[PDB]
Design a protein around this ligand. Sequence first.
Ligand SMILES: [Mg+2]
Ligand SMILES: [Mg+2]
Ligand SMILES: [Mg+2]
Ligand SMILES: [Mg+2]
Ligand SMILES: [Mg+2]
Ligand SMILES: [Mg+2]
Ligand SMILES: [Mg+2]
Ligand SMILES: [Mg+2]
Ligand SMILES: [Mg+2]
Ligand SMILES: [Mg+2]
Ligand SMILES: [Mg+2]
Ligand SMILES: [Mg+2]
Ligand SMILES: [Mg+2]
Ligand SMILES: [Mg+2]
Ligand SMILES: [Mg+2]
Ligand SMILES: [Mg+2]
Ligand SMILES: [Mg+2]
Ligand SMILES: [Mg+2]
Ligand SMILES: [Mg+2]
Ligand SMILES: [Mg+2]
Ligand SMILES: [Mg+2]
Ligand SMILES: [Mg+2]
Ligand SMILES: [Mg+2]
Ligand SMILES: [Mg+2]
Ligand SMILES: [Mg+2]
Ligand SMILES: [Mg+2]
Ligand SMILES: [Mg+2]
Ligand SMILES: [Mg+2]
Ligand SMILES: [Mg+2]
Ligand SMILES: [Mg+2]
Ligand SMILES: [Mg+2]
Ligand SMILES: [Mg+2]
Ligand SMILES: [Mg+2]
Ligand SMILES: [Mg+2]
Ligand SMILES: [Mg+2]
Ligand SMILES: [Mg+2]
Ligand SMILES: [Mg+2]
Ligand SMILES: [Mg+2]
Ligand SMILES: [Mg+2]
Ligand SMILES: [Mg+2]
Ligand SMILES: [Mg+2]
Ligand SMILES: [Mg+2]
Ligand SMILES: [Mg+2]
Ligand SMILES: [Mg+2]
Ligand SMILES: [Mg+2]
Ligand SMILES: [Mg+2]
Ligand SMILES: [Mg+2]
Ligand SMILES: [Mg+2]
Ligand SMILES: [Mg+2]
Ligand SMILES: [Mg+2]
Ligand SMILES: [Mg+2]
Ligand SMILES: [Mg+2]
Ligand SMILES: [Mg+2]
Ligand SMILES: [Mg+2]
Ligand SMILES: [Mg+2]
Ligand SMILES: [Mg+2]
Ligand SMILES: [Mg+2]
Ligand SMILES: [Mg+2]
Ligand SMILES: [Mg+2]
Ligand SMILES: [Mg+2]
Ligand SMILES: [Mg+2]
Ligand SMILES: [Mg+2]
Ligand SMILES: [Mg+2]
Ligand SMILES: [Mg+2]
Ligand SMILES: [Mg+2]
Ligand SMILES: [Mg+2]
Ligand SMILES: [Mg+2]
Ligand SMILES: [Mg+2]
Ligand SMILES: [Mg+2]
Ligand SMILES: [Mg+2]
Ligand SMILES: [Mg+2]
Ligand SMILES: [Mg+2]
Ligand SMILES: [Mg+2]
Ligand SMILES: [Mg+2]
Ligand SMILES: [Mg+2]
Ligand SMILES: [Mg+2]
Ligand SMILES: [Mg+2]
Ligand SMILES: [Mg+2]
Ligand SMILES: [Mg+2]
Ligand SMILES: [Mg+2]
Ligand SMILES: [Mg+2]
Ligand SMILES: [Mg+2]
Ligand SMILES: [Mg+2]
Ligand SMILES: [Mg+2]
Ligand SMILES: [Mg+2]
Ligand SMILES: [Mg+2]
Ligand SMILES: [Mg+2]
Ligand SMILES: [Mg+2]
Ligand SMILES: [Mg+2]
Ligand SMILES: [Mg+2]
Ligand SMILES: [Mg+2]
Ligand SMILES: [Mg+2]
Ligand SMILES: [Mg+2]
Ligand SMILES: [Mg+2]
Ligand SMILES: [Mg+2]
Ligand SMILES: [Mg+2]
Ligand SMILES: [Mg+2]
Ligand SMILES: [Mg+2]
Ligand SMILES: [Mg+2]
Ligand SMILES: [Mg+2]
Ligand SMILES: [Mg+2]
Ligand SMILES: [Mg+2]
Ligand SMILES: [Mg+2]
Ligand SMILES: [Mg+2]
Ligand SMILES: [Mg+2]
Ligand SMILES: [Mg+2]
Ligand SMILES: [Mg+2]
Ligand SMILES: [Mg+2]
Ligand SMILES: [Mg+2]
Ligand SMILES: [Mg+2]
Ligand SMILES: [Mg+2]
Ligand SMILES: [Mg+2]
Ligand SMILES: [Mg+2]
Ligand SMILES: [Mg+2]
Ligand SMILES: [Mg+2]
Ligand SMILES: [Mg+2]
Ligand SMILES: [Mg+2]
Ligand SMILES: [Mg+2]
Ligand SMILES: [Mg+2]
Ligand SMILES: [Mg+2]
Ligand SMILES: [Mg+2]
Ligand SMILES: [Mg+2]
Ligand SMILES: [Mg+2]
Ligand SMILES: [Mg+2]
Ligand SMILES: [Mg+2]
Ligand SMILES: [Mg+2]
Ligand SMILES: [Mg+2]
Ligand SMILES: [Mg+2]
Ligand SMILES: [Mg+2]
Ligand SMILES: [Mg+2]
Ligand SMILES: [Mg+2]
Ligand SMILES: [Mg+2]
Ligand SMILES: [Mg+2]
Ligand SMILES: [Mg+2]
Ligand SMILES: [Mg+2]
Ligand SMILES: [Mg+2]
Ligand SMILES: [Mg+2]
Ligand SMILES: [Mg+2]
Ligand SMILES: [Mg+2]
Ligand SMILES: [Mg+2]
Ligand SMILES: [Mg+2]
Ligand SMILES: [Mg+2]
Ligand SMILES: [Mg+2]
Lengths: 129, 122
Amino acid sequence: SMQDPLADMLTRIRNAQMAEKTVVSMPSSKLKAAVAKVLKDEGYIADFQISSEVKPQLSIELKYFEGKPVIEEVKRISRPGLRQYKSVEQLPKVRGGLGVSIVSTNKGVMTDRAARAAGVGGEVLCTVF
Amino acid sequence: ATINQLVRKPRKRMVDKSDVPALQNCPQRRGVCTRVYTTTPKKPNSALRKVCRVRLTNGFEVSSYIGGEGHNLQEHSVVLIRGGRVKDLPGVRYHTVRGSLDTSGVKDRKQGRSKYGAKRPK
RNA sequence: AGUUGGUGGGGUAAAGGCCUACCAAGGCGACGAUCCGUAACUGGUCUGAGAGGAUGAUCAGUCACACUGGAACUGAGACACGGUCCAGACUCCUACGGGAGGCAGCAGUGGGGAAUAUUGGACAAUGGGCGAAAGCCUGAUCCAGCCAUGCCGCGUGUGUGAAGAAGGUCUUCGGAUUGUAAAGCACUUUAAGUUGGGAGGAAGGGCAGUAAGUUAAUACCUUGCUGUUUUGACGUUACCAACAGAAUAAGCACCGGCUAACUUCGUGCCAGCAGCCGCGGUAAUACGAAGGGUGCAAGCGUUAAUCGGAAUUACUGGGCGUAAAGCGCGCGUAGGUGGUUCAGCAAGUUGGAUGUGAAAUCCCCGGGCUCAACCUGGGAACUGCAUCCAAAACUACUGAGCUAGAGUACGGUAGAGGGUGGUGGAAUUUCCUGUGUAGCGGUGAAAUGCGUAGAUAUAGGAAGGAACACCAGUGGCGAAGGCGACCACCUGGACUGAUACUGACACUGAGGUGCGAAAGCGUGGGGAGCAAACAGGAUUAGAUACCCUGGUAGUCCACGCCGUAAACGAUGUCGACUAGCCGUUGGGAUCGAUCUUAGUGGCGCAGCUAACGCGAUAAGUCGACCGCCUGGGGAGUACGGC
RNA sequence: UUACCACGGAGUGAUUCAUGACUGGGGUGAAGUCGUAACAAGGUAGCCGUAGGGGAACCUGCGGCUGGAUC
RNA sequence: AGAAGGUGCGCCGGCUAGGGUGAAGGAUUUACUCCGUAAGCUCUGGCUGGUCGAAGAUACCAGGCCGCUGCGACUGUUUA
Ligand SMILES: [Mg+2]
Ligand SMILES: [Mg+2]
Ligand SMILES: [Mg+2]
Ligand SMILES: [Mg+2]
Ligand SMILES: [Mg+2]
Ligand SMILES: [Mg+2]
Ligand SMILES: [Mg+2]
Ligand SMILES: [Mg+2]
Ligand SMILES: [Mg+2]
Ligand SMILES: [Mg+2]
Ligand SMILES: [Mg+2]
Ligand SMILES: [Mg+2]
Ligand SMILES: [Mg+2]
Ligand SMILES: [Mg+2]
Ligand SMILES: [Mg+2]
Ligand SMILES: [Mg+2]
Ligand SMILES: [Mg+2]
Ligand SMILES: [Mg+2]
Ligand SMILES: [Mg+2]
Ligand SMILES: [Mg+2]
Ligand SMILES: [Mg+2]
Ligand SMILES: [Mg+2]
Ligand SMILES: [Mg+2]
Ligand SMILES: [Mg+2]
Ligand SMILES: [Mg+2]
Ligand SMILES: [Mg+2]
Ligand SMILES: [Mg+2]
Ligand SMILES: [Mg+2]
Ligand SMILES: [Mg+2]
Ligand SMILES: [Mg+2]
Ligand SMILES: [Mg+2]
Ligand SMILES: [Mg+2]
Ligand SMILES: [Mg+2]
Ligand SMILES: [Mg+2]
Ligand SMILES: [Mg+2]
Ligand SMILES: [Mg+2]
Ligand SMILES: [Mg+2]
Ligand SMILES: [Mg+2]
Ligand SMILES: [Mg+2]
Ligand SMILES: [Mg+2]
Ligand SMILES: [Mg+2]
Ligand SMILES: [Mg+2]
Ligand SMILES: [Mg+2]
Ligand SMILES: [Mg+2]
Ligand SMILES: [Mg+2]
Ligand SMILES: [Mg+2]
Ligand SMILES: [Mg+2]
Ligand SMILES: [Mg+2]
Ligand SMILES: [Mg+2]
Ligand SMILES: [Mg+2]
Ligand SMILES: [Mg+2]
Ligand SMILES: [Mg+2]
Ligand SMILES: [Mg+2]
Ligand SMILES: [Mg+2]
Ligand SMILES: [Mg+2]
Ligand SMILES: [Mg+2]
Ligand SMILES: [Mg+2]
Ligand SMILES: [Mg+2]
Ligand SMILES: [Mg+2]
Ligand SMILES: [Mg+2]
Ligand SMILES: [Mg+2]
Ligand SMILES: [Mg+2]
Ligand SMILES: [Mg+2]
Ligand SMILES: [Mg+2]
Ligand SMILES: [Mg+2]
Ligand SMILES: [Mg+2]
Ligand SMILES: [Mg+2]
Ligand SMILES: [Mg+2]
Ligand SMILES: [Mg+2]
Ligand SMILES: [Mg+2]
Ligand SMILES: [Mg+2]
Ligand SMILES: [Mg+2]
Ligand SMILES: [Mg+2]
Ligand SMILES: [Mg+2]
Ligand SMILES: [Mg+2]
Ligand SMILES: [Mg+2]
Ligand SMILES: [Mg+2]
Ligand SMILES: [Mg+2]
Ligand SMILES: [Mg+2]
Ligand SMILES: [Mg+2]
Ligand SMILES: [Mg+2]
Ligand SMILES: [Mg+2]
Ligand SMILES: [Mg+2]
Ligand SMILES: [Mg+2]
Ligand SMILES: [Mg+2]
Ligand SMILES: [Mg+2]
Ligand SMILES: [Mg+2]
Ligand SMILES: [Mg+2]
Ligand SMILES: [Mg+2]
Ligand SMILES: [Mg+2]
Ligand SMILES: [Mg+2]
Ligand SMILES: [Mg+2]
Ligand SMILES: [Mg+2]
Ligand SMILES: [Mg+2]
Ligand SMILES: [Mg+2]
Ligand SMILES: [Mg+2]
Ligand SMILES: [Mg+2]
Ligand SMILES: [Mg+2]
Ligand SMILES: [Mg+2]
Ligand SMILES: [Mg+2]
Ligand SMILES: [Mg+2]
Ligand SMILES: [Mg+2]
Ligand SMILES: [Mg+2]
Ligand SMILES: [Mg+2]
Ligand SMILES: [Mg+2]
Ligand SMILES: [Mg+2]
Ligand SMILES: [Mg+2]
Ligand SMILES: [Mg+2]
Ligand SMILES: [Mg+2]
Ligand SMILES: [Mg+2]
Ligand SMILES: [Mg+2]
Ligand SMILES: [Mg+2]
Ligand SMILES: [Mg+2]
Ligand SMILES: [Mg+2]
Ligand SMILES: [Mg+2]
Ligand SMILES: [Mg+2]
Ligand SMILES: [Mg+2]
Ligand SMILES: [Mg+2]
Ligand SMILES: [Mg+2]
Ligand SMILES: [Mg+2]
Ligand SMILES: [Mg+2]
Ligand SMILES: [Mg+2]
Ligand SMILES: [Mg+2]
Ligand SMILES: [Mg+2]
Ligand SMILES: [Mg+2]
Ligand SMILES: [Mg+2]
Ligand SMILES: [Mg+2]
Ligand SMILES: [Mg+2]
Ligand SMILES: [Mg+2]
Ligand SMILES: [Mg+2]
Ligand SMILES: [Mg+2]
Ligand SMILES: [Mg+2]
Ligand SMILES: [Mg+2]
Ligand SMILES: [Mg+2]
Ligand SMILES: [Mg+2]
Ligand SMILES: [Mg+2]
Ligand SMILES: [Mg+2]
Ligand SMILES: [Mg+2]
Ligand SMILES: [Mg+2]
Ligand SMILES: [Mg+2]
Ligand SMILES: [Mg+2]
Ligand SMILES: [Mg+2]
Ligand SMILES: [Mg+2]
């Protein structure tokens, strides 16, 4: 019944990335917007736009580079059934730093690298590589 | 199993029962030969196997196998038994130690004669 | 039921139902009370990459106990381990009247067991009791004795030496191997043996003098220093040196694969071996020996036990279409989880500071014993808990919102959805009556059976029970089980279109609650056809079957029970995404065509799967919750509850 | 002399061990006796639930499934 | 099932709680009426002492109980 909207966002991105599409549209929220922005800063997507009119729609344009999609493995970590939190010393590494893990901290939603840069841990949302 | 299901009822370790219920956590135990007889192995094998029925200090009554070519066990012989199952004989779970109390070990044996209680020929 | 709270009082070193008299009826429990079984706890130990699993010998901290059950006294401290009293069980002394005893202190004995040691020395050192001080006591302690029980170290010689000696073994009879191995030749003396030297564990005590302080006093006394004397169980110490000689000192398991190491001779499904596969019945690299070899080595094997490998209880890190595994199906309680905006709060979360987290142990850098084991300095760690400070993304909590989830109001559509009555036509059977006469029926072929007491066929009439051809469809409706004649009455739900409304009211669901084919059970009706049981005839070696002729329960109705099915898509419910093509049942739109919903079928790209195969009606990509599985039998059985 | 109370008595229950004449199934065995139920359309297609019957595998009725061959 | 089994019980005081009847008073329907009554009489209790005997349900009165089995379901009837 959409008890996790972020998992729906990542599932939509993965499913339409596998299907060789160009734009993904979904209901938006101020958390999905932060996730989309942090992906944009990491070069995993082309662009994201938020619609107006009371029921905003968020649309994301994807990248392909070669014949294979740029995002090959995206996975949610902290679900509503588990709620995983980690400290600075325990922030997970995906592909030994070749990827990124999104972390929600009291300074906002950022990457694990920025998380150690500010020295603030938090909740591990998902891992992308 | 889901995380909530596991919280309500965690995973359980199974316990493995010992194959030697007599001699409760003991390396060896002594007993008395209530009778010495001879029996026949299972299907693919054909032989005439020597076995002694032994009553232990526990009060248990079990059957032990006598190794080697010869033996001198008879009624009311005090013996020591150790673990070890004989595959061909059904119901035989123990071995009789040669050369410990009343078994005297095999004679004219010269190779590997420490499992049969034989002194160095010298 | 002093049970839970209150008041007055008592009592204790001290709070308190700790106790007492009244007042009230409370307290605990599915976050597991009560009851049953088992067990001292921790630092730690062993395994494991870790997470975990197993476990509390030795050493250290705490607790409890002192033949069994009670009780108090003395005391700063005890309900008292070598104290008192009372009772009990069990031993013993006795002159027969009468008393004593408690090794779970150190040695020791019997017993039990597979199994665990000396009736040793000294208070020299460190501690403890008393004394003022000498000093006395101390089975604490320090040391010795025994035991390959473990960990570590060192020996059992070194170099040269080819007639490749003799012997053993194998052979193609040439030889190969044991093998530089042996012998011979030349070296060295570790350890053990004998003899001579020789520390360190030692601080102090006694005596005399001296110098300070003590007062009021050079006295006594305390303290410094000087001189002399005196102390060791271990102990024939550690250690060092000299002497003769190679002399004093290798065993155990295995050799088919897993697994490093191969051939002969005996034996012939015997004797035997074996962790698992399995060897042995006349050429056995698997049994038993011999030669050779391989692993370890003062040890080597076997047995018992824990963890690992085992991702084989899977948090990390598994599964449920067919291998084990989705409840027969709904509704719903506790619980778990929660669409989207603001604002607040700071429980979760994050960062910092402070206190604690005993020592020992494990880890790092060092220091000593000739090395190592061992001892020891410093550090790191002890991943935890607690209190303050700060942050506000997420979760939780509070206030106000919103309409994308959910629901309400209004017209229509389809339907074997359910219940109570009534009514139809075809057909079977039975009874009556007419005509008519020798067969009917059934089979693979027969027979039983029905017929001249007039059958079957044929015509008319009557009675009664049950099922509802053709429509009929990969068709429809229902949560599932299931629901087909027609009509009336009562009644649930679903599809479909627009507008308006409520404003998260949602999903799942352990327990519980209902519905639930057929067969079956109870009471009362009904009974045409069919038909378990049963009778007879066939078939057959037999035929308690298949086949034939009959035939009772049952099948039908009302009410009640029963709770099961290959109750199946062998596939839990809910939500969101992901190329296409061909049908079909309801309904909408736009112009027979195009689009769009809710079902019901056939193919198929990615993806998935062990494969078959699934593939928008997933078994694909993901979320929320629940159920279930852990080798085959025994067994969905026994016992207990309901 | 009273209060508290250990031992010890009396009555009646619960639970748990061992044992018991005699009985019911199960497993493992070897060249035994009787049949041939399943696997092919296994020679009457097999299974599932329920009822009756029979030396035994099993047969028959009622409902269900395909995890059934020919077509 | 009164299963089985157990505890108390006499007499004299102290304190204490209830019920019935019922003057005086009050009301109106003024009379064979309604409410209600101090004393007296009468019937139920509670917790606290003391005291005698060998014994307090003291006499008469007044169930014995339990465990396995056969038969008949039971209450009833029958050979004056
Ligand atoms: Mg073994
Ligand atoms: Mg009280
Ligand atoms: Mg008080
Ligand atoms: Mg009080
Ligand atoms: Mg419990
Ligand atoms: Mg214990
Ligand atoms: Mg592991
Ligand atoms: Mg560990
Ligand atoms: Mg380790
Ligand atoms: Mg423990
Ligand atoms: Mg000890
Ligand atoms: Mg201690
Ligand atoms: Mg403590
Ligand atoms: Mg202590
Ligand atoms: Mg304590
Ligand atoms: Mg104690
Ligand atoms: Mg003792
Ligand atoms: Mg004792
Ligand atoms: Mg005592
Ligand atoms: Mg006393
Ligand atoms: Mg006293
Ligand atoms: Mg005192
Ligand atoms: Mg004590
Ligand atoms: Mg004492
Ligand atoms: Mg004591
Ligand atoms: Mg003590
Ligand atoms: Mg003692
Ligand atoms: Mg005494
Ligand atoms: Mg006594
Ligand atoms: Mg006594
Ligand atoms: Mg003793
Ligand atoms: Mg002792
Ligand atoms: Mg003890
Ligand atoms: Mg002994
Ligand atoms: Mg013994
Ligand atoms: Mg020993
Ligand atoms: Mg000892
Ligand atoms: Mg001393
Ligand atoms: Mg003296
Ligand atoms: Mg002594
Ligand atoms: Mg030693
Ligand atoms: Mg040994
Ligand atoms: Mg030992
Ligand atoms: Mg030779
Ligand atoms: Mg020497
Ligand atoms: Mg000295
Ligand atoms: Mg000497
Ligand atoms: Mg090999
Ligand atoms: Mg061998
Ligand atoms: Mg041979
Ligand atoms: Mg072998
Ligand atoms: Mg051999
Ligand atoms: Mg051995
Ligand atoms: Mg072992
Ligand atoms: Mg084990
Ligand atoms: Mg083992
Ligand atoms: Mg494991
Ligand atoms: Mg294992
Ligand atoms: Mg593993
Ligand atoms: Mg898991
Ligand atoms: Mg598995
Ligand atoms: Mg599941
Ligand atoms: Mg199967
Ligand atoms: Mg299910
Ligand atoms: Mg199902
Ligand atoms: Mg269900
Ligand atoms: Mg349920
Ligand atoms: Mg249910
Ligand atoms: Mg079932
Ligand atoms: Mg529900
Ligand atoms: Mg709820
Ligand atoms: Mg939310
Ligand atoms: Mg909630
Ligand atoms: Mg907020
Ligand atoms: Mg913190
Ligand atoms: Mg520590
Ligand atoms: Mg050193
Ligand atoms: Mg703030
Ligand atoms: Mg006729
Ligand atoms: Mg007719
Ligand atoms: Mg159906
Ligand atoms: Mg029925
Ligand atoms: Mg019936
Ligand atoms: Mg009936
Ligand atoms: Mg009837
Ligand atoms: Mg009939
Ligand atoms: Mg028939
Ligand atoms: Mg018939
Ligand atoms: Mg009939
Ligand atoms: Mg019947
Ligand atoms: Mg009916
Ligand atoms: Mg069905
Ligand atoms: Mg099933
Ligand atoms: Mg299955
Ligand atoms: Mg279901
Ligand atoms: Mg589903
Ligand atoms: Mg629903
Ligand atoms: Mg769904
Ligand atoms: Mg859905
Ligand atoms: Mg397909
Ligand atoms: Mg699969
Ligand atoms: Mg598979
Ligand atoms: Mg999940
Ligand atoms: Mg979940
Ligand atoms: Mg899920
Ligand atoms: Mg099993
Ligand atoms: Mg088993
Ligand atoms: Mg088993
Ligand atoms: Mg059962
Ligand atoms: Mg049993
Ligand atoms: Mg039962
Ligand atoms: Mg009695
Ligand atoms: Mg009793
Ligand atoms: Mg008793
Ligand atoms: Mg019994
Ligand atoms: Mg018995
Ligand atoms: Mg018997
Ligand atoms: Mg059959
Ligand atoms: Mg057959
Ligand atoms: Mg058949
Ligand atoms: Mg046949
Ligand atoms: Mg078949
Ligand atoms: Mg069954
Ligand atoms: Mg059947
Ligand atoms: Mg039947
Ligand atoms: Mg039956
Ligand atoms: Mg039959
Ligand atoms: Mg039937
Ligand atoms: Mg059928
Ligand atoms: Mg009575
Ligand atoms: Mg008296
Ligand atoms: Mg009585
Ligand atoms: Mg009685
Ligand atoms: Mg009887
Ligand atoms: Mg009798
Ligand atoms: Mg009678
Ligand atoms: Mg009678
Ligand atoms: Mg009778
Ligand atoms: Mg009767
Ligand atoms: Mg009767
Ligand atoms: Mg009467
Ligand atoms: Mg009577
Ligand atoms: Mg008479």
